[PDB]
Homo-oligomer: A and B are copies of this chain.
Amino acid sequence: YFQSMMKIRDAYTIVTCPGRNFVTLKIVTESGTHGIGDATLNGREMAVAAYLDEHVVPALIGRDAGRIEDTWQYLYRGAYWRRGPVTMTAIAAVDMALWDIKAKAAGMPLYQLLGGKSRERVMTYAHCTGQTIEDCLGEVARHVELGYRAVRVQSGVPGIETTYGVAKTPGERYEPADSSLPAEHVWSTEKYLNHAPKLFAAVRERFGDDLHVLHDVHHRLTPIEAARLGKAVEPYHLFWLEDCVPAENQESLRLIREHTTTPLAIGEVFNSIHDCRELIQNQWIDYIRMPLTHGGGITAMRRVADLASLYHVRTGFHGPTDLSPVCLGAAIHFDTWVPNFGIQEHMPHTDETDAVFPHDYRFEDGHFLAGESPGHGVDIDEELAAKYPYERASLPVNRLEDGTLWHW
């Protein structure tokens, strides 16, 4: 009976823009029980939608939803063309939806299914950003009042019009995919390297040593430049220095690790354990940032987290607005169970987004609390979602001062 009940009756995607674009996969079993999974890939959303709609969804009909592992392998190996952002996001969406269903069928919140809670709450960090160091400091003050124990700090660089994590116009909400076609930013590494240490010095001067302070380099340096920055910020004891260098070549982290004791984080642009196996095994990083939606879902990320744990590496899930509350809820469940949890990024969604994706995770005093509802605790209001049609938005590109297409 349970098998017939777990047979997939229907599966389909939902595309909505309640503040920004989200793509969601819904899987409905013969029992009526459904699961949903995040399928949002910022700036390439419709590639994943088509991957799902045309190629994956039709193969899901009639399958046993209880066979999570088999389905993961069927889609991963069966695609023939393996790994990649579009590929692994589609697989993650299916996987997340199937774990949602399994937890509902078991009558348990997801964290219970994974092995139970390892912690009573989930520490987060907030994005503190400003045009000037002082503007950023004001935001740090604000978030400490909200109870955040950890903050990521980003401020504008003098001589540079636009830099990562800083809004074009003060007060306004930072949402990077801000244009139909990519905005074009200009970059100077040398000016940034001379300025960045001043920001952390100021944070420590005003806020002291107890605050966890994070910084995202956002792919812009070469290894020896990142080594230099790491050394320069050692006195400020950062929680992490993130995305120092593009790391398709994983050996790129070696020179940084050999030259600094500033902790390193990487991985939000990764989608496979094969993108980071060497980074982990060689102890070149301290935190792995690959999130559920882009990293092949729960099934794959359990394996990544477990590999990390052998080398003292901790989880630091990417948590921007462009991963939906479906991912965030599942992530908080995962974060609640995983032994080697590090931190959870929190970039709050719009009220409109929260309304479209009702959920039972809570934020209190700087931390997340996992929901107790069976499933990952998130759902989608299809009627409300239909009120916000897709609107194309691309991520910016970054060029050097001479026009060289660089890393954003």
**B contact residues around A408 at 8 Å (CB):** 77-78, 80
Q: Is the CB of A83 within 8 A of B81?
A: no
Total interface residues on A, CB under 8 Å, equals 123
A47 CB contact (under 8 Å) in B47, B74, B117: B47
**Stretch in A28-36, A167-175, A305-313 with 4+ CB within 8 Å of B:** A305-313
State in angstroms the CA–CA spacing of A113 and B294 once bound together.
24
Q: CB-defined interface of A216-251 with B at 8 Å, one 1/0 digit per residue?
A: 000000111101100100100100000001101101
**B contact residues around A45 at 8 Å (CB):** 54
Most buried by B among A69, A210, A269, A314: A69
Q: Smallest distance from the beta carbon of A302 to chain B beta carbons, Å?
A: 8
Q: Is the CB of A397 within 8 A of B78?
A: yes
Q: Is the CB of A403 within 8 A of B79?
A: no
Q: Is the CB of B84 within 8 A of A83?
A: yes
State in angstroms the CA–CA spacing of A402 and B223 once bound together.
34
**B contact residues around A80 at 8 Å (CB):** 42-43, 269, 395, 408
Q: Is the CB of B70 within 8 A of A118?
A: yes
Lowest 4 A-B CB distances belong to which pairs? A84-B84, A106-B106, A81-B85, A50-B50
List A residues at the B interface (Cβ < 8 Å).
41-51, 53-55, 58-59, 64, 66-70, 73-74, 77-88, 102, 105-108, 112-123, 159, 180-182, 190-191, 193-194, 209-210, 212, 222-225, 227-228, 231, 234, 237, 245-246, 248-249, 251-252, 254-255, 257-259, 261, 263-264, 269, 271-274, 277, 281, 283, 286, 294, 299, 302-303, 306-307, 309-312, 314, 337, 339, 341, 367, 392, 394-395, 397, 400, 402-408
